[PDB]
From a paper:
Here, we report the crystal structure of HHARI in complex with a UbcH7 ~ Ub thioester mimetic. In order to gain insights into the molecular basis by which the RBR Ub E3 ligase HHARI recruits the E2 ~ Ub thioester intermediate, we used an E2 ~ Ub thioester intermediate mimetic that is stabilized by isopeptide bond formation between a lysine residue that substitutes for the E2 catalytic cysteine, and the C-terminal glycine of Ub (denoted as E2-Ub throughout). Almost all contacts between UbcH7 and HHARI involve the RING1 domain and the Ub molecule projects away from the surface of UbcH7, adopting an ‘open’ conformation that results in contacts to the UBA-like domain of HHARI. The UbcH7 and HHARI catalytic cysteines residues are separated by ~ 54 Å, thus, the structure suggests that the UbcH7 ~ Ub intermediate can be recruited to HHARI in its autoinhibited conformation and that UbcH7-Ub binding does not induce large-scale conformational changes required for thioester transfer of Ub from UbcH7 to HHARI. While the Loop2E3 region adopts the same conformation in all HHARIAPO structures, comparison of HHARIAPO and HHARIE2−Ub structures reveals a striking conformational change in the Loop2E3 region that is centered around His234 and Gly235. This Loop2E3 conformational change unmasks an E2-interacting surface that is buried in HHARIAPO structures and results in positioning of the loop closer to the surface of UbcH7 in the HHARI/UbcH7-Ub structure to facilitate additional intermolecular contacts. Most prominently, Lys96 of UbcH7 projects towards an acidic surface on HHARI that is unmasked as a result of Loop2E3 flipping upward towards the surface of the E2 compared to its conformation in HHARIAPO structures. The model reveals that the Loop2E3 insertion of the HHARI RING1 domain (His234-Gly235) sterically clashes with Ub in the closed conformation, in particular residues Leu8 and Leu71 (bottom).
RBR E3s are a distinct class of Ub E3 ligases that harbor three tandem zinc-binding domains termed RING1, in-between RING (IBR) and RING2 (collectively called an RBR domain). However, rather than facilitating Ub discharge from E2 ~ Ub onto target protein lysine residues directly like a canonical RING E3, E2 ~ Ub binding to the RING1 domain of RBR E2s is followed by thioester transfer of Ub to a catalytic cysteine residue in the RING2 domain similar to HECT E3s14–21. HHARI (or ARIH1) is a member of the Ariadne family of RBR E3 ligases, which also includes TRIAD1 (ARIH2), ANKIB1 (KIAA1386), and Cullin-9 (PARC). In addition to the RBR domain, HHARI harbors an unstructured N-terminal domain rich in glycine and acidic residues, a UBA-like domain, and a helical C-terminal Ariadne domain that is characteristic of Ariadne subfamily members.
Author numbering:
A (entry chain F): -2 to 76
B (entry chain B): 100 to 172, 180 to 394, 401 to 554
C (entry chain E): 4 to 154
């Protein structure tokens, strides 16, 4: 809704552009990736500024402003 | 019909395939190693998926991520982050991520992943969140132990072998070599190390029995109740003097260690030896209601056929010791007269002795799954005619060889081991011809 | 034995908010003891004692954690064992600091996950009848859990 524009780097290195809101839940983002690139939200791990973006909080809790970069990493195997 | 390649020879033929596949894909050579090993080395199938879409799923499913390409964007003691030691930058080397670690810790990490619970193809930089692969080069450069380097060179090439119909490893423990044939024919092959394994299944050469049956045998023994009883051929007792006797050599023709009880008997059946081979004596044949009695009768039948197979097992291993004593019966005999024509005729004899023992082990496997047919009793005769011929040949090369002169060993052994293979000949010719007419199953 | 001297040194300095009373057997630095204090119910009523057992090949082989204080959790065995992927075999990275593992164990305590449990019975209870779970683990913390540290 033109409230937030963020970038996410995929596993293949391609950096796709998402559009969200500052009050959007982090779980909402992990779903948009599934519709976009086909990776289930279980096999996802989001990293920003060094620390992991676990599902359960929101974009506002982390200092994530507009035009920010976000990294998509693999989650730990067979626990 | 036979070609043997080295571990690195395969790796070269594989990395070349990785190279041509990669130049259209343009992925780090470590990544494309995974993707093809995921597509079972079907080059065309990875091309299709890549020429289509949905790559992030492929990377996520194969658990592999590309690194940020380094192209974009010296003697000081920086602290290491795995051991917390102070070494100059000359000691640190790192992967594409920029995680630099001392070559000491790298060596322990890479080796402990190869040698412990096997990490096949998929080693990653050991820096917490880092999941980027470790290239083959930085493994061969950071490992000195060649036994590790050879094992890693087997792991990362393993997928390329099993997925190939014309390739198969050798069951030798630390030998990492591959046999290449023109077509899978379930035929034996030489491993460059004296291993003659069936190319089809992958076990030792099972001439009489089919491949699928031997698999059912091992699986049955390992699974339940039989991994505990196979240790029983250690010691027995004399069937006459009742003294405890321990079997030493491969030959079963026992003779009691007693001056007062010089009775010669059989190790398997505990019967007197002389009648073995007679008309009315069988210690190789079985020839023997309720549902509870139906199961116990079939279990003891297995013990009859398993005890034969397990006895010829240890007896084969006890007859490989002859190779060490054949070279002590090939030197001074070549020293006396006629060197290196009479000594090679003596090794070809013990080669047949262990061959008739190997086929004797699988003789009972093929016999355990047989329905008592008109061809069963015929086969049982060729079995008893071979099992006896082996015990004679094995008995001579364990006691009667030292107490003879060299003017007699030439004709003694030559008549024995050539007759012994003549009984294996008719036995195999029988079951092979009987195979062509389907005269015996289950 | 050189890294452990610096790791245990880092804990005593910067301090761990969820880990208190870090007392270890001296000389032998292969076994550690410590007391965990969760921040969220139904466990925020007590404190639980864990024991770390670094193997000789540390840090090239991961440690093993066992709970000495009994606990009501689907991912924690009755004896005290714990399935934690960050110290598993095919996941272990030697760069992973110890305090990094502890804070990863806190997350398993605060927000359990029943998809891969050690006690399936408690895993079912947590997903179907949450209120029955938050009451059993409430009473299970009061009875067996040790008291929380002052400050
Ligand atoms: Zn180091
Ligand atoms: Zn790294
Ligand atoms: Zn070999
Ligand atoms: Zn076979
Ligand atoms: Zn006797
Ligand atoms: Zn007998």
């Amino acid at each position: 809704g033109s409230h937030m524009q963020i970038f996410v780097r995929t596993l293949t290195g391609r950096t796709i552009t998402l559009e969200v809101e500052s009050s959007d839940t982090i779980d909402n983002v992990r779903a948009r990736i599934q519709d976009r690139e086909g990776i289930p939200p279980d096999q996802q791990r989001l990293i920003f500024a060094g620390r992991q973006l676990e599902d359960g909080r929101t974009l506002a809790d982390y200092n994530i402003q507009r035009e920010s970069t976000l990294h998509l990493v693999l989650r730990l195997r067979g626990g | 019909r036979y070609e043997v390649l080295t571990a690195e020879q395969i790796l070269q033929h594989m990395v070349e395939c990785i190279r041509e596949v990669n130049e259209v894909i343009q992925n780090p050579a470590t990544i494309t190693r995974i993707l093809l090993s995921h597509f079972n080395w079907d080059k065309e199938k990875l091309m299709e998926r890549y020429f289509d879409g949905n790559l992030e799923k492929l990377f996520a499913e194969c658990h592999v991520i590309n690194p940020s390409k380094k192209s974009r964007t010296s003697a000081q003691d920086m602290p290491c982050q795995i051991c917390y030691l102070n070494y100059p930058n000359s000691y640190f080397t790192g992967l594409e991520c920029g995680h630099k670690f001392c070559m000491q810790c790298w060596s322990e990490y890479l080796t402990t992943k190869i040698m412990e619970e096997g990490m096949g193809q998929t080693i990653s930089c050991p820096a917490h969140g880092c999941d980027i692969l470790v290239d083959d080069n930085t493994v061969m450069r950071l490992i000195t132990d060649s036994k590790v380097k050879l094992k890693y060179q087997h792991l990362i090439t393993n997928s390329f072998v099993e997925c190939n119909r014309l390739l198969k490893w050798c069951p030798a423990p630390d030998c990492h070599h591959v046999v290449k044939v023109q077509y899978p024919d379930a035929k034996p092959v030489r491993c460059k190390c004296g291993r003659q394994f069936c190319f089809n299944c992958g076990e030792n050469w099972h001439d009489p029995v089919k491949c699928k049956w031997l698999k059912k045998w091992i699986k049955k023994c390992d699974d339940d109740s039989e991994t505990s009883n196979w240790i029983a051929a250690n010691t027995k007792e004399c069937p006459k003097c009742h003294v405890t006797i321990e079997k030493d050599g491969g030959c079963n023709h026992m003779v009691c260690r007693n001056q007062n009880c010089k009775a010669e008997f059989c190790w398997v059946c505990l019967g007197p030896w002389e009648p073995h081979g007679s008309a009315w004596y069988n210690c190789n044949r079985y020839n023997e209601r309720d549902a509870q009695e139906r199961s116990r009768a079939a279990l003891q039948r297995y013990l009859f056929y398993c005890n034969r197979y397990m006895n010829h097992m240890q007896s084969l291993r006890f007859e490989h010791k002859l190779y060490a004593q054949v070279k002590q019966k090939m030197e001074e005999m070549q020293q006396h007269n006629m060197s290196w024509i009479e000594v090679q005729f003596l090794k070809k004899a013990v080669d047949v002795l262990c061959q008739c023992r190997a086929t004797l082990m699988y003789t009972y496997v093929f016999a355990f799954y047989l329905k008592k047919n008109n061809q069963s009793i015929i086969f049982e005769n060729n079995q008893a005619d071979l099992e006896n011929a082996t015990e004679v040949l094995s008995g001579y090369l364990e006691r009667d060889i030292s107490q003879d002169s060299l003017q007699d060993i030439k004709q003694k052994v030559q008549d024995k081991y050539r007759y012994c293979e003549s009984r294996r000949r008719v036995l195999l010719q029988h079951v092979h011809e009987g195979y062509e007419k389907d005269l015996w199953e289950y | 034995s050189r890294r452990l001297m610096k790791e245990l040194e880092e804990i005593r300095k910067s301090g761990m908010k969820n880990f208190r009373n870090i007392q270890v057997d001296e000389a032998n630095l292969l076994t550690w003891q410590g007391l965990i204090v969760p921040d969220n119910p139904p466990y925020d009523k007590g404190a639980f004692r864990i024991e770390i057992n670094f193997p000789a090949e540390y840090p090239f082989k991961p440690p093993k954690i066992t709970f000495k204080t009994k606990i009501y959790h689907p991912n924690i065995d009755e004896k005290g064992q714990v399935k934690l992927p960050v110290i598993s075999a095919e996941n272990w990275k030697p760069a992973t600091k110890t305090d990094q593992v502890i804070q990863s164990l806190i997350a398993l305590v605060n927000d359990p996950q029943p998809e891969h449990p050690l006690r399936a019975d408690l895993a079912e209870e947590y997903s179907k009848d949450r209120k029955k779970f938050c009451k059993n683990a409430e009473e299970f913390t009061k009875k067996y859990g040790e008291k929380r540290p002052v400050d």
